[PDB]
Amino acid sequence: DVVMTQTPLSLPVSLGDQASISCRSSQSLVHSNGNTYLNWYLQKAGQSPKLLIYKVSNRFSGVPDRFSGSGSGTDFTLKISRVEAEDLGIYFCSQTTHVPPTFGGGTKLEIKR
């Protein structure tokens, strides 16, 4: 199925700066109609998962607006107005456009060093 290459592998940023994680999709995530259904994700060391965008840029209910998604077809990104302690951890980007669902990736985001 469509592969999702998460990048970069590391994103050292201070809790306050803007962070933009990328994500590429083998043959784009455009369903048979011209619509893209992406699902950004984030998880800490054994904590409660958090979903940001659920299409391409719109933010899911609960997102502090600081999260923003964008991109074309075989490329996507998640810019954050400001990183917080909770934001730290590993990032991911899923997609419900193709089947079966992918769900995976892993961008390291543990503050700036």
Curated annotation (Swiss-Prot):
Xref: PROSITE patterns: IG_LIKE
Region (Framework-3): 62-93
Domain of life: Eukaryota
GO cellular component: immunoglobulin complex
Disulfide pattern: C23-C93
Region described as Complementarity-determining-2: spans on this chain: 55-61
Span list, region Complementarity-determining-1: 24-39
Positions of the UniProt region annotated as Framework-2: 40-54
Region (Framework-1): 1-23
MF annotations from Gene Ontology: antigen binding
Region spans: Framework-4: 103-112
GO biological process: adaptive immune response; immune response
InterPro entries given in the database record: Ig-like_dom (IPR007110), Ig-like_dom_sf (IPR036179), Ig-like_fold (IPR013783), Ig_sub (IPR003599), Ig_V-set (IPR013106), IgV_Light_Chain (IPR050150)
Keyword Repeat: no
Region (Complementarity-determining-3): 94-102
CDD domains recorded: IgV_L_kappa (cd04980)
Keywords, alphabetical: Adaptive immunity, Disulfide bond, Hybridoma, Immunity, Immunoglobulin, Monoclonal antibody
The keyword Disulfide bond appears for this protein: yes
Extra information: This chain was isolated from an IgG2a hybridoma protein that binds digoxin.
Protein name as catalogued: Ig kappa chain V-II region 26-10
UniProt source species: Mus musculus
